[PDB]
Design a protein around this ligand. Structure first.
Ligand SMILES: CC(=O)S[C@@H]1CC2=CC(=O)CC[C@]2(C)[C@H]2CC[C@@]3(C)[C@@H](CC[C@@]34CCC(=O)O4)[C@H]12
Length: 249
């Protein structure tokens, strides 16, 4: 047992091992970069990324101590935070925050950001990547923060297993605290601040997403079944005031 306990990978080590492989957009560079084409491509990429999110959630420590309804809830609430945060990370790691690195076959410069018709939302996410450069964010801090985003929104009256969620959330907050190890406190607070700031960015991304979804026929913006499922459930929940964002500050 002493050997067993000592060799057991730390939660952070597991997070590295389970991090999904970077996914391809299947961006069709032969179609013109109209807003309609780009947004439909982003939605298709979102579908493929959500496949990976679910797989990663299956094997996420603490996350299976949670009832199936709570797991589904948290993913539906936070999928946008997870995917936009991962975007900021890939942009930071693969292009030194020069570009928005959606996929290896789909990298946005300024021109694409304008063409997508969500220029300001792209800017918001790029700004997060530029903060990654200011902070020199580490993969370790990144993976923990991403789990904290998964646990950043709950039903206004709580989850089916509120105590286990609370326990799991505190453990990852602890993991973050241990990982940032005067200078220690300041980094931790800068990271908690960045996480908080994701709620406002994500509310704006969701607002655009929900709008585009409800008008997808007029807009000619396609959504894959994966996204149709998530948004169809999430939209009326979020709009009935059933979502509660958790803030550090
Ligand atoms: C600048 C951003 O943060 S894009 C945002 C995050 C993201 C990162 C990826 O890597 C994969 C692609 C996603 C998940 C986008 C998919 C498309 C989303 C949902 C967009 C916000 C608004 C939009 C555009 C069309 C629509 O109907 O809603 C998502």
């Amino acid at each position: 047992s002493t050997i067993s306990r000592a060799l057991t990978p730390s939660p952070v080590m597991v997070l590295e091992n389970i991090e999904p492989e970077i996914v391809y957009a299947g961006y069709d560079s032969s179609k013109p970069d109209t807003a309609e084409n780009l947004l439909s491509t982003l939605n298709r990429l979102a579908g493929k990324q959500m496949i990976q999110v679910v797989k990663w959630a299956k094997v996420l420590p603490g996350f299976k101590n949670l009832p199936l309804e709570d797991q589904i809830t948290l993913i539906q609430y936070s999928w946008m935070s997870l995917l936009s945060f991962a975007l900021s990370w890939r942009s930071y790691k693969h292009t030194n925050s020069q570009f928005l690195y959606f996929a290896p076959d789909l990298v946005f410069n300024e021109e694409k950001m304008h063409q997508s018709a969500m220029y300001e939302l792209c800017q918001g996410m790029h700004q997060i990547s530029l903060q990654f450069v200011r902070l020199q964010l580490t993969f370790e801090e990144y993976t923990i923060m991403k789990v904290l985003l998964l646990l950043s929104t709950i039903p206004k009256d709580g989850l089916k297993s509120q105590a286990a969620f609370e326990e799991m959330r505190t453990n990852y907050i602890k993991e973050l605290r241990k990982m940032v190890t005067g200078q220690s406190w300041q980094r931790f607070y800068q990271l908690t601040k960045l996480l908080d700031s994701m709620h406002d960015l994500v509310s704006d991304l969701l607002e655009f997403c929900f709008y585009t979804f409800r008008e997808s026929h007029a807009l000619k913006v396609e959504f894959p079944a994966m996204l149709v499922e998530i948004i169809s459930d999430q939209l009326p929940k979020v709009e009935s005031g059933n979502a509660k964002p958790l803030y550090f500050h």
